[PDB]
Design a protein around this ligand. Sequence first.
Ligand SMILES: CC(C)[C@H](Nc1ncnc2[nH]c(-c3cnn(CC(=O)N(C)C)c3)cc12)c1ccc2c(c1)OCCO2
Length: 168
Amino acid sequence: VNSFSGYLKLTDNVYIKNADIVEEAKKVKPTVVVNAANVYLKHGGGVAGALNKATNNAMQVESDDYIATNGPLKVGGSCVLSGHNLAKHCLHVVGPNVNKGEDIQLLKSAYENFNQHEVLLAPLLSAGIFGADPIHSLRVCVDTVRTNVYLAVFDKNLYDKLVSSFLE
Ligand SMILES: CC(C)[C@H](Nc1ncnc2[nH]c(-c3cnn(CC(=O)N(C)C)c3)cc12)c1ccc2c(c1)OCCO2
């Protein structure tokens, strides 16, 4: 049903809210929820661990069967699988992990995957323990994504800093 509410409108197609992406998926019932994935789809930590636990491990079981036959994703790449009880589909997107020396330039490629979907509920790619500058990830999102993206950022201090810096 894609019933998003309580978002700040940053541009004509990018919205942001201080919220847990899991609670937003349960309220909104989106067509697509984006996972902040890694190349072997190991759903531990951050967004991935929270989405997988909210599916009672159904996401991990499906992802392990996908990887057994198809192998790992590339950094900047994505994979549509089931959204289970959270969404119709889950778009698993791998942003670069700059704390592990991956190329920050691939963050644009990671957000370009969003353009295949009319509307998405998504996290801020490559933030948290992946190490990218959040203000930079928000600018790449705004400059790259043309479809409707609703960003859920589960940290009030980070949310306030992003909004204040975007509005300068
Ligand atoms: C930057 C941060 C704030 C962001 N995290 C998040 N952004 C949006 N919704 C989120 N939910 C959770 C979460 C975790 N646990 N729970 C359950 C819970 O707290 N319960 C009490 C039941 C919910 C984290 C989260 C982020 C974004 C991208 C990343 C990244 C992290 O980790 C590495 C890859 O990429």
